Amino acid sequence: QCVNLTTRTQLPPAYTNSFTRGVYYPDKVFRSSVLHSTQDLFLPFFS
Amino acid sequence: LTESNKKFLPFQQFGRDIADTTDAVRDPQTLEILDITPCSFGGVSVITP
Amino acid sequence: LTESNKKFLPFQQFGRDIADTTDAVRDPQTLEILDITPCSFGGVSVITPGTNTSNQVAVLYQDVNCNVFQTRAGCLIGAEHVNNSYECDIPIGAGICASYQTSQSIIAYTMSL
Amino acid sequence: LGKLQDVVNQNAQALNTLVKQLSSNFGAISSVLNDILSRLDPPEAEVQIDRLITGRLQSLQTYVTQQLIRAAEIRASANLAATKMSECVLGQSKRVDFC
Amino acid sequence: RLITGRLQSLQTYVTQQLIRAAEIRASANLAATKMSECVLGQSKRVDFC
Amino acid sequence: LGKLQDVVNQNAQALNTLVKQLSSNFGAISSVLNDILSRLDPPEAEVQID
Amino acid sequence: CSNLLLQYGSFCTQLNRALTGIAVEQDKNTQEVFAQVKQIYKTPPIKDFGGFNFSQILPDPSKPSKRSPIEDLLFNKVT
Amino acid sequence: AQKFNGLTVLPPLLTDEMIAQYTSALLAGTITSGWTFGAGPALQ
Ligand SMILES: *[C@@H]1O[C@H](CO)[C@@H](O[C@@H]2O[C@H](CO)[C@@H](O)[C@H](O)[C@H]2NC(C)=O)[C@H](O)[C@H]1NC(C)=O
Ligand SMILES: *[C@@H]1O[C@H](CO)[C@@H](O)[C@H](O)[C@H]1NC(C)=O
Ligand SMILES: *[C@@H]1O[C@H](CO)[C@@H](O)[C@H](O)[C@H]1NC(C)=O
Ligand SMILES: *[C@@H]1O[C@H](CO)[C@@H](O)[C@H](O)[C@H]1NC(C)=O
């Protein structure tokens, strides 16, 4: 079960800037001392 | 399948090299890192007097 | 569709060139001869001062016609043209190079022989 | 050193390109020739293997031509170096602005 | 087949241009040697300048 | 004389290699085009001829 | 692949012969460049050449390689 | 022309004026110094 809330004064959402964030492993392989480029969904920098 | 000296991060099963060739695969049941090398090949050269 | 200065005989609709490309067609509405020119294209180029010297770069166009300086080797942006001449190091073409000189910014100048 | 580095870098990148050419299907449905043989019927499998061999044979000829041109350039440079050795090193050369 | 034929024509043009560039390099080396010897001094090589 | 013999042998071997390459099928069902023309119709045998 | 390779084994022979010729040509290049003399001349033990210092181009016995320091630097500079 | 089909030409690094200047400088050196300027400083 759930209940409803009441109207109140809230704050508008703000916008911030990312700084070298949103990088993960695009695969499950081991790569040492190489520069490998892949096409995959990531987070833009300075967005 | 030789015995390697390089450790793998505990989420990887494969492994490649600079030339993009699968030459290092982790054995799944005891977690050893083993390298892959082609057996041998070459040519039969002969010297004639 | 530019305005031509050559007229056609009153029985033709098309017009070709030496390279056998349709580059001239008569407009049927008012019997006006209009040229055909292919739309602009080319390749961008990057002028780099080098590693551990600067960070900013300049963008060079090969044959596209347009801070911004119109060179004889296309369009150069990001490099300020200066009238004096030194010995150049990074070739561009048509007798003008680019270099990083005094802060300090990338400049373009005619070569000194 | 510039002259001694290009002759190695070009060969290394040509070998890398030759390795990378095996990763392309050349318009077929697979890159490795084992998958099509182990997955498709023998009569139809002969038209993808033919595509693969044509693609790799086309790849193997441009490298040969580039190596032949590079070998000709190396021969010219070696002849120039041998003449320079035999003149400037093995005696005194009267040719101005040659040594 | 259009891509394959165009690639063949482009490769033939590239090989022809490379051969022409090698010939141009030989001619330019000969011209540079001639400028270094016959122009930048007097050359003792008979029937060369 | 090594050089003259070598260049003559290279030219002769290249010409003989071309002649024997004329005897190859290049993945087709025959080498000579006349056999394919006589045994198969030109509308169907166009791909082999090509 | 080998069963289809007999239609292009002649091209394979041509490319193999071209590679063999390139290899033997580069092998002959070193003979035409460095093998100018057939007598190996030993450096004299006396280093008094009127004041000319030749230790930078002559080999040194301090290292097993017996390569001149200029030559060793050249070897180390290029990869 | 031959540039409508993507076959762009590259302008030369040295324009004809610069090659003319180089040839004139070489001519002046070879008529005022001989071979001294080709193997060191120019000597009148
Ligand atoms: C010839 O040049 C070499 C330079 O490599 C000289 O060797 C140096 O000599 C000084 C003087 O004692 C030493 O401090 C250096 O450590 C030496 N360097 C090396 C690399 O050995 C050598 O002395 C010179 N010989 C003559 C006769 O002038
Ligand atoms: C695999 O399972 C066996 C038992 O089934 C176990 O003894 C062995 O340690 C396991 N290997 C691992 C966890 O790497
Ligand atoms: C480039 O375009 C401008 C405006 O479109 C024009 O004035 C100028 O003449 C053009 N440059 C050339 C070289 O035609
Ligand atoms: C360079 O100096 C000349 C001298 O008359 C002048 O005409 C020209 O405008 C100057 N160029 C710049 C960019 O200051």
Note down, in words, how this protein is organized.
This is part of a larger assembly, with eight copies of chain A. By secondary structure, chain A is largely without helices or strands. Chain A contains no helices and no strands. The two termini of chain A are 40 Å apart. Chains D and G meet through helix 1 and helix 3 of D and helix 2 of G. A molecule of 2 linked components (NAG-NAG) binds next to loops of chain G. Chain G: It comes from Severe acute respiratory syndrome coronavirus 2 (2019-nCoV). Chain G: This is Spike protein S2. It is classed as viral protein/immune system. Keywords: RBD, Viral protein, VIRAL PROTEIN-IMMUNE SYSTEM complex. The entry is titled "SARS-CoV-2 spike trimer (6P) in complex with three R1-26 Fabs".
Oligomer: part of a larger assembly
- What is the count of helical runs of chain A? 0
Which structural class fits the helix and strand makeup of chain A?
little secondary structure
Proportion of residues in extended strands of chain A: under 5%
Number of strand elements of chain A = 0
Gross geometry of chain A = elongated
Which ligands accompany this protein?
Answer: a molecule of 2 linked components (NAG-NAG), 2-acetamido-2-deoxy-beta-D-glucopyranose
Largest interface: D-G, 25 and 19 residues
Largest sheet of chain A: none
Q: Level of helix content of chain A?
A: under 10%
Rounded to the nearest angstrom, the radius of gyration of chain A is: 20 Å
Distance between the termini of chain A: 40 Å
Protein name (chain H): Spike protein S2'
Organism (chain H): Severe acute respiratory syndrome coronavirus 2 (2019-nCoV)
